[PDB]
Amino acid sequence: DPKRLYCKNGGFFLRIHPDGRVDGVREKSDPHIKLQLQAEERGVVSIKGVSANRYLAMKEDGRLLASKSVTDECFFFERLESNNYNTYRSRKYTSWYVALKRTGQYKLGSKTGPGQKAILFLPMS
Numbered sequence: 823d824p825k826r827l828y829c830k831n832g833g834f835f836l837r838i839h840p841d842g843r844v845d846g847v848r849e850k851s852d853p854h855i856k857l858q859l860q861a862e863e864r865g866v867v868s869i870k871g872v873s874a875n876r877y878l879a880m881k882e883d884g885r886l887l888a889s890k891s892v893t894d895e896c897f898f899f900e901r902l903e904s905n906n907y908n909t910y911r912s913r914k915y916t917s918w919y920v921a922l923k924r925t926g927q928y929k930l931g932s933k934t935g936p937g938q939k940a941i942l943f944l945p946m947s
């Protein structure tokens with residue numbers, strides 16, 4: 823079943839545009855925030871935009887985008903933290919997290935880390 827990823831940092835839903843752009847939006851009705859999270863192994867997921875047909879990827883410089891193809895940049899550790907929010911940490915760039923800023927823009931992976939509000943998401947159906 824599809825999920826919406828609600829970010830604790832400002833209450834933005836993770837959004838994947840048809841063109842590959844990634845950002846955040848507060849509108850629960852937005853057509854581009856419905857995501858498919860598929861387990862590739864225990865604790866490892868890909869994140870696909872249902873509307874966009876693109877997979878969330880983190881690049882070597884921390885950029886977030888969504889690609890048509892699934893590559894090693896499209897896998898993330900899904901962890902339930904002690905505060906009961908999930909985090910999604912790049913399987914390839916292992917210190918960097920999927921994250922949204924308070925402005926609704928995505929946060930560059932190299933600017934993220936374990937104590938931040940920006941990396942915390944709650945999956946909702």
Ligand SMILES: CO[C@@H]1O[C@@H](C(=O)O)[C@@H](O[C@H]2O[C@H](COS(=O)(=O)O)[C@@H](O)[C@H](O)[C@H]2NS(=O)(=O)O)[C@H](O)[C@H]1OS(=O)(=O)O
Pocket residue numbers: 831832922923924925929937938939940941
């Ligand atoms: C409440 O948790 C964090 O702190 C907030 C805050 O202190 O305002 C947010 O930080 C964001 O804004 C501050 C201040 O920016 S300003 O433009 O100078 O006002 C920045 O210093 C932070 O880098 C910003 N972080 S963000 O991830 O880009 O939003 C924010 O809610 C929380 O920051 S956190 O890094 O996610 O913990």
